[PDB]
Subunit: 160 residues, 12 copies
């Protein structure tokens, strides 16, 4: 189904097709996450907005880099790294981020929930990739730890 014509040496094509499907959905989640982080950066107001900007800037740049790395891994395995928004909205398993112009507590509380979905999805993908290819598993594990640390910074703000 997503089975490629050829793939990376040492991986069977059928197994690569299943890894491609796992990475395709992680790529959707990372693309939706950096769109959401920018949305938060643009629409946060109130006395903590500078702190949200300072926190989110480096996360947006790092999440965009994660997406590039997962996409190029898809391509290497023989798949299509689908990056268009129509496809993302058609295939995702979560709803649009719903906060508009709002203070930091409102945005950060909602972004914490966004990150729970992302990190749980990545933790499931790590388990599936670990059975098919340790190079892709290793890629996902480093990104999972960075995403959990970005979530911790969001949570630390909400603590007390």
């Amino acid at each position: 189904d997503l089975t490629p014509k050829y793939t990376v040496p040492g991986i069977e094509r059928e197994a690569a097709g299943r890894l491609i499907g796992v990475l395709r959905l992680r790529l959707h989640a990372l693309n939706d996450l950096h769109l959401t982080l920018k949305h938060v950066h643009w629409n946060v107001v109130g006395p903590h907005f500078i702190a949200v900007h300072e926190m989110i800037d480096p996360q947006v740049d790092q999440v965009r880099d994660m997406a590039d790395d997962v996409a190029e891994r898809i391509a290497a395995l023989g798949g299509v790294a689908q990056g268009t928004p129509g496809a993302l909205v058609a295939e995702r398993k979560w709803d649009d981020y719903s906060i508009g112009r709002a203070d930091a507590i409102a945005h950060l509380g909602a972004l914490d929930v966004v990150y729970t979905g992302v990190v749980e999805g990545m933790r499931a993908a790590v388990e599936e990739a670990g059975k098919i290819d340790p190079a892709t598993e290793d890629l996902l594990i480093g990104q999972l730890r960075d995403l959990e640390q970005f979530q911790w910074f969001v949570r630390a703000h909400l603590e007390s």
Copy 2:
């Protein structure tokens, strides 16, 4: 309707609400454009793919910067700079980019059509902004010229 509670000094609120609606749709177009440029970068293959990468890299970074500048202008005028993909897909007036894994001619021919839509949309927005606020018109005119030049690089490849 999009009329803000307050806006930039010297601009009437009702006129700001109309400028907000114009910039909201330009922001959708710029967000869809950098998602599309990344999609092309990830999925171009064949003997010209390195040239497409070299052309598209700086365009992705510059288009992401244009989106930030239009979004912060929306925010300053009193509007919501909507950056989520569900809203973009619900409000846009064009279809998803449709090329998957493909050679440079296929991608560049389709990206040329994408850019015609963007530059015509920006040229219309320049005319509307010029009647409401010269600072926003000046922002859009500099971005229009850069987008047309990015389109020229795409077209030059297809020439002959």
Copy 3:
């Protein structure tokens, strides 16, 4: 009166003298604005002072650069770019910024009022310059948009 002995090619001397008077007062406003921004940076205290520092630092550097560009434009047109404080206090049409040691809300609320005066003054100068010389009008329009965006960051803090 401010009519120069010679001016930039293509501009009449009498019209240049009127543009010189418009830019002389904008230069006073920009000089008073960066003195005021430094005053705020030095005297803000309380739990948001780091956020005020982070916001104001880049504004001070950019406003100092705007002043240099308006001054060199005055010089090119044949006028004196008057930068001394005695003259600024004698010719300005606004009062000294009045907040001493104080928290962010007090400073930012007063700085918002300062910026309304600056941006309204710049918007009036844009209209006058547009009738005399499009190169000077274009200079002022780019600075107006940056000043309005700096005002938005001040306002966003006070929102809610």
Copy 4:
């Protein structure tokens, strides 16, 4: 005549052909100007030559960049950005710069006259472009202001 086969979206081909002719002559003037500035840098002597070097260095680099931007605009509009010296000498409407080895006053006095021709030519091109395409007009207006400021530095030396 200079009418292109196709041009930037939203501009009629016949109007683009006239804008191409206007930009072609501005490109000749900018190319002759940076050749002339280098000639001055290489052949100025006497007790002010270090000051002429310091003034002219950044102008040469900026004028070379202006030429690239006008040339790429010509190309985008569908025209030939003609950069060879035989064509420049055949089409220009001014004479060769005539000062050889000479002191700063001699060179700067002649370069001031060169710049009057350039800035008047650019001011005329701005008016023509403003009727055909605001993106090209905006390009030329920013270059005009920088050229007038470079002329002011040349004039300031000769003042007294």
Copy 5:
């Protein structure tokens, strides 16, 4: 009178209030000095103006940094670092710099007199601070030596 509510550990409040008054007037002098240096940079003409620009550029940047350091020292001691021009003009003990558009000799001769006032004021402040707090005395002594060296560069030009 300027006695603070609290001050740096190890310094008595009454003595801190007197040190605050000494630093407040030095801050006025440094603020007026960088406004004056910019005024000179903007309004110097004639065959030595490039040399004045090259000399004054680094002095303006360094004097602005000195002002920040004295202001933050005032703040640490418990005082208001007053940076507005109305207050500077009301409290200063010298007149406005009086040279408009003029050649280097005119400006440099007047700036030399400005610096004599600044360096004598700083030398008096060093003596007063040395009796109250060696950390503030050490700050002022490093700035005094840099200011005297900037004065030497101004004087060297006028020598012969």
Copy 6:
């Protein structure tokens, strides 16, 4: 007792031994201070934690540099710059910083008390060094002023 076998030229060995003892305890205080600043950075939570991070980062780097400079001065004088934690805990004259996971007010209030101890200790060391060696006194005076300024930033947050 701490009397070295040889020391810097121009200083008597017995006096160097007393200066070594003074610097050894200042080195303990600086080492405990950067360990404490890192502890605060790692364990601050709540809506001001980003501001505490931004404040403490540069202080940690600068305090680590102060420790290196005092240690190398000890070494030059002929002493052992003791940097291990067992020795620091055995020789220090203050208790462990006691705040765990906590908001900015809790940490900053405790860090202010830490800095009072450090700056009073440094002010006493300056007086002792000034009697033995002006080069070591000058080192300590520059560090004292920076530490007091770092304390002011901590205090400014707690003001109101």
Copy 7:
């Protein structure tokens, strides 16, 4: 006991509490290691001291970075990253580094023994973390390899 109130998504609280205890002791070991490396840098003498400086400089900077990463991981898991020296001395399972002023062979021989303890401790922590959370295991494995390589550089000096 160290069981947190909440932890990273996908990890049980009780298991997180055990991982927190493992990382708390690794953080003590890394903090004691960079204090020890600085102690060696400050107190090495003799004809190989420049080589010890060149070797230890980058290790100190990298070990300080490892400590930050383990501490922020503790914080994300819900624990206290304890960084104070009293606690480190109370909880560690090794003695203070015991070499004072000494040549490279003496220091490097003792530092080799220090590193054996650190790398064995890290190898045990990797095994425990691998059973609880692959993201924390992956963090520790990259640090283990760098620490073993730093130990090799220390050993290579002592070889022959």
Copy 8:
């Protein structure tokens, strides 16, 4: 046989000797790979040679860095990191790259076959190292993924 006299703490000497043999052959493969990549860079001609240069440059630099990291790991484990060409030619299990001066398709087709051998060899080494030492396995897994991605760029060119 390759059993070292001593090795990294926590690894048995006999097992280290087997890991040394595995890494010795991977080092030969990486050394032959960067020699081969340079050979391709120097001898590619035809209309795609600039694209091959742009692709291969960063690969040569990264492969040279991989070789350094594997060699230093060998050294740490107690082995000889053999880097001379006589030994590489005597011990390798593949033939010399055979393409001389040739177009991109010829070189890239042959380099794809080279990379299949390298990545299969690295995937086998990962499995062997994973049984002996997770730090060396982790090193090899990150290099495997980068090598497979470099192979994908070579393959993408040949696609269609």
Copy 9:
């Protein structure tokens, strides 16, 4: 005829005049070459245009630097480094580059012929300079080798 009034120490004036004539024509050739390279960069189209841009960019910058070095050598020898286009067109011994908007093969084939003329001219100048002054011969020999290497990159594209 081109005999200078004075020249570099150790060179006879008459011989310097002949070296000046040789360098004057090489300066014309280098000036026409960088004008031609820019012309090619601006007017190349088709599927290889990005590769031509990447090749020509560094050549334009390096050829402009060669021209500066030959011009300053002319000046040092006592001659006029003539840089204006009227003089270049009057004195050159080759025709204007004749390709307008065209694909890479057309431009590169013509640029190869341009470079043959330049490198043969430089090789003749090296022989003449070698008889008059080894410092000028050494300057020309380094530029000849770089020009031949730039020609090789142009030729490599056309190979097959």
Copy 10:
């Protein structure tokens, strides 16, 4: 035999073929030299190994750059720049470097002998190239002097 189909302008094909043979063997020697320098860097141990690392690092980078320059010169002349190890071992006129894990004196003594062979080979190549083409002779002479200076640093260590 190595006679190329075409070569650099101004050089006869038969003479180019002989220069190609001379440069082909120098390229082998430079390739074997940087492989050997890396081998030494990886396998030096004992109390001077940091000094050998510091000496050899810059030599490896510079020797790799020399190889690129000789290879591109071969290519320009019409030859194959052979970079594979099988060919190097088949064509070289010296034996493999024979020192494994060893102290600095052992490695440096052997590397000195390696460099004698390289510099004598380069000095012979300079004489042959000087008869065929001064641009290639000039390339080799600059590399010879750098290689002799690298040999001096190796020898200086062994002196006494």
Copy 11:
């Protein structure tokens, strides 16, 4: 005698003349010191020469900077900063450094004696300047501490 015509404000001319004489001899000592440090760098051989290079490089650059600062202070005070070697040899109160080609112990032992003379001379100059001008005293005290620290690095090598 060295009494200047005018001097820095606030210093009597006769006292300035005595300070000029003190700084003139310190400038000789700093000039002779950086000539001597270069001499050592160029002529050290044996197994520690790389360590001497690494130590002396930064000292040469810093000592050259000290000389510039003392010279510009002399100039500001109204004196001649004498930098020629004939004058240095005629006025100095020490002999030429006497070690030629030699190992590190020989050079470092002699350089230690050189530094004792420099630091004792600087300590005497600090005492004399402290009575005339605190700005010059402060300059000399910072340089004294850096020179003593450079001496410590030389001594540390000789320790044991």
Copy 12:
């Protein structure tokens, strides 16, 4: 006499001893030249002193680099690179630079005479080295051309 015990491969010891004597005197001339350039920088006054500073700064840095390169060449050949001022004054064949505090014309006129001596000395050394070793001749020829160009900048100021 200056015959070394051993020298660079391929050069006879007796010939090396004569080349060492030639380079020893060139090193004296370069050392005296950068001491003289600093002397001029420190003691130039009057309305052109900023221009002299701007000209001389880069020359001092480049002449110091030339001295290092000649000294390391002496060392490689087996000689002593003598850098002390007593030896320079004893062996030089020219007098001390004689201008004290003076305007640019006085200094530049004298520095022009200094450079004539240096460049004539270097031109003689080039001829002698060319007979013994082309690598040393090539070093001296590049330095000669840079020195002549530095002399041209000094002369250009004095022209008219």
